[PDB]
C-alpha cells in the first residue's frame, strides 16, 4: 500500500550510446508492509502497475527506475539505484543490490543480482547470485533448439563474469572472471577461476561438470579455452594455457597445465595422467593411467595417435 | 632373480649439506620376470637384502641408489636416478621415477613419487600421487588415497587424503586437507596451511596474483563445506568458512571466533574478530582504499548489505 506522487520527472538511462529520458512519478508509502514504514517515499515507477500493491516487494532507492512493461512483485527487494525497464519479471524473495535488467528478464524464487546487468529474454530463477560486476546478456540464438532461453537456477555463482547467448548454469558452480557464451553449461561442482590477468572462455557447446576445476594461468594469456564439445568431467583440472577442441574430454583424477597446451580431434585424459608443459596432443589419443608427460620448457612435445598413454608411461620428449 | 656386480665402486650422495659415499655393488638380472631382459644392469645396492629376489620389483637406472636399510618389494618400479637410503619401505604396486626417498619412510600400494622427496618416517600409501617438485618431509604424517601433491611442501603431521587436490602450497603442523579440497597456489603466491586446521568439503582456498597475496591458515581455523577463500587473506583462531559462503578479496583478516556460512559474500580489504556470523544473502563489500571493520558479537544473516564499517554496537564499545 502506497500513493503515486502528484508531479513526474524526467529522468535518463544508459543503454546502446543514446541518452533517453522518462516520466516517472515518486512511489510512497502509505502503511507499514515490511521494513518500510508508512511516510517513507521509495523509487520512481513508470505507472501503478510495476509495483504490485500486494506482497512486500518495494523499490527502496529514491532514485532507482522501472519503467517499462516491468512488474515487481512478491517479497521482492530493489535496494540501490537500480534500473529495469522492459516486461521485466521480478517477484519472489529476488534481492536486486544495485543492478539493471533490461529486456525480457524474469528474475525469480530466492536469486540475488548485485552491481550486475541482466539485458534480454533469459530466467534467472534458483538461488543463483549473479554479482561482482557480472554481464548477463542473452541475445542471438539462431539455427540450434527452440530459444533455450539462458538459465542460471539452482546455487550457481557467477562472480565478474559475462554469461551471453544460450548458456546455462546450474550446479553448485562457481563461475569467476571468466566468458560464457553460446550454449555451454557448468553445472555441479564445477569450478571457473580466471583473475585480473587471464579470463576463462567456455564457448560452443563446452560444458564443465564434475568438480572439475579450470583455472587460468598468470602468464601472458593464459587463458584456458573451452572451444566445442569438449567438456572437463570429474576431478578433472584444467589450468593456465590450454584449448581443447572438437571431440574431447577430461576427467578423472587428471591434471593439465603449463606451457601452450592443445587438444583436438578426439582426445582423452583420465586416470591420474598428468600432462605438463608445451604439449599438442591431436588425434586419438588416450592418456589415463599414472602416466605422465611433462614437456620441460623450450621443448614441445607432439602426439599424435592413435595411441595409448596408460602405463607408468613417462613420456619427455615427442615420439618419433 | 639377479647377481651381484663383481667389484664394488663409489657413489656419494648429498644430504644435509654433505658428500657422503657408501661402497655399492651392482644389480644384474639373470632372468625374466617383467620387462627386464637377462643379462641387463640395473641399479646399485649395497648388499642383496635391499632389492627382492621375488616379485617384480626392480632398479632400472645404473645410478640409481638403494643401500642402508633400505627393503624394496614386491613389484616396486623405481626408473630413474634415485637416492633411497636409512629405513626406506617400498614394497606394493608403487613407483619411483626421478625421486629420493630419504629416511624411514614407507611408501606403499599405487603410490607414485616423481620429481620429490621424502624424510623422516611417514607414510604414502593411497594411490596417493607425489610428484613435480614436491617435497616431502616429516619430522606421524600421512598423504593416502587418491591425493594429490604438486610442487608443494608438506611437513611435520600434516595428512592428505580424500581427493583432495594440493598445488603450490605449505601445510606444515598438524595440518589436514581430505575430501575435494583444492589448494592452488602458483608462481608468485604459495598456499600456506600451518597449526590444526583443515581444508575439506568442496573448499577452496586459491592464491592471489596481487603480491603476498597469500592464503593463510593458522590455528584450529578451517574452511569447509562449498567455501572458497582467495587472495590475500589469513584465517587467524576459532575461524570456521563453510557453506556456500566466499571469501575473496584485498587484506582480510578473520578473528577470535567466526563464522561465515550462508551465501556469505566477503569481498575487500575487511577485518572480522570477536564473536561473528556472516551467514545469509549477506553481501559485505569494500570498494577499494576502503576499509570495512565488523567487530563483534553481531550477526550477519537476512539481505543485509554493508560497505561502510558498521558505527554502532560492538564497534563502539566492549565488554
Ligand atoms: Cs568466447
Ligand atoms: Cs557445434
Ligand atoms: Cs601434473
Ligand atoms: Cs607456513
Ligand atoms: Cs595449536
Ligand atoms: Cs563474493
Not at 175 to 203: P, S
Not at 273 to 289: F, M, T
Request: with cysteine; glycine share 8%.
Amino acid at each position: 500500500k502506497y500513493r503515486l506522487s502528484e508531479g513526474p520527472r524526467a529522468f535518463t538511462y544508459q543503454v546502446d550510446g543514446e541518452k533517453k529520458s522518462v516520466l516517472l512519478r515518486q512511489v510512497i508509502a502509505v502503511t507499514d508492509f515490511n521494513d518500510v514504514k508508512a511516510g517513507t517515499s521509495g523509487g520512481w515507477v513508470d505507472a501503478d502497475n510495476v509495483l504490485s500493491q500486494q506482497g512486500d516487494c518495494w523499490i527502496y532507492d529514491e532514485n532507482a527506475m522501472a519503467f517499462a512493461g516491468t512488474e515487481i512483485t512478491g517479497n521482492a527487494r530493489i535496494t540501490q539505484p537500480c534500473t529495469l525497464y522492459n516486461n521485466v519479471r521480478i517477484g519472489d524473495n529476488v534481492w536486486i543490490d544495485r543492478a539493471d535488467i533490461s529486456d525480457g528478464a524474469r528474475i525469480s524464487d530466492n536469486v540475488t543480482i548485485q552491481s550486475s546487468s541482466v539485458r534480454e529474454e533469459c530466467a534467472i530463477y534458483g538461488d543463483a547470485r549473479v554479482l561482482n560486476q557480472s554481464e548477463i546478456l542473452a541475445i542471438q540464438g539462431l539455427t540450434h533448439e527452440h530459444a533455450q532461453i539462458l538459465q542460471i537456477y539452482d546455487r550457481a555463482t557467477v562472480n565478474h563474469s559475462r554469461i551471453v547467448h544460450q548458456v546455462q548454469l546450474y550446479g553448485n558452480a562457481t563461475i569467476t572472471h571468466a566468458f560464457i557464451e553460446h550454449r555451454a553449461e557448468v553445472f555441479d561442482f564445477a569450478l571457473i577461476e580466471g583473475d585480473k590477468d587471464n579470463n576463462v572462455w567456455i564457448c560452443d557447446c563446452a560444458k564443465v561438470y564434475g568438480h572439475a576445476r579450470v583455472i587460468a594461468g598468470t602468464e601472458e594469456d593464459a587463458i584456458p579455452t573451452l572451444r566445442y564439445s569438449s567438456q572437463v568431467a570429474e576431478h578433472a583440472l584444467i589450468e593456465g594455457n590450454c584449448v581443447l577442441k572438437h571431440h574431447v574430454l577430461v576427467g578423472g583424477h587428471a591434471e593439465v597445465r603449463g606451457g601452450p597446451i592443445l587438444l583436438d580431434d578426439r582426445v582423452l585424459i583420465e586416470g591420474h595422467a598428468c600432462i605438463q608443459g608445451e604439449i599438442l596432443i591431436e588425434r586419438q589419443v588416450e592418456i589415463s593411467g599414472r602416466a605422465a608427460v611433462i614437456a620441460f620448457d623450450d621443448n614441445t612435445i607432439h602426439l599424435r595417435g592413435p595411441k595409448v598413454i596408460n602405463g607408468e608411461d613417462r613420456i619427455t620428449r615427442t615420439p618419433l
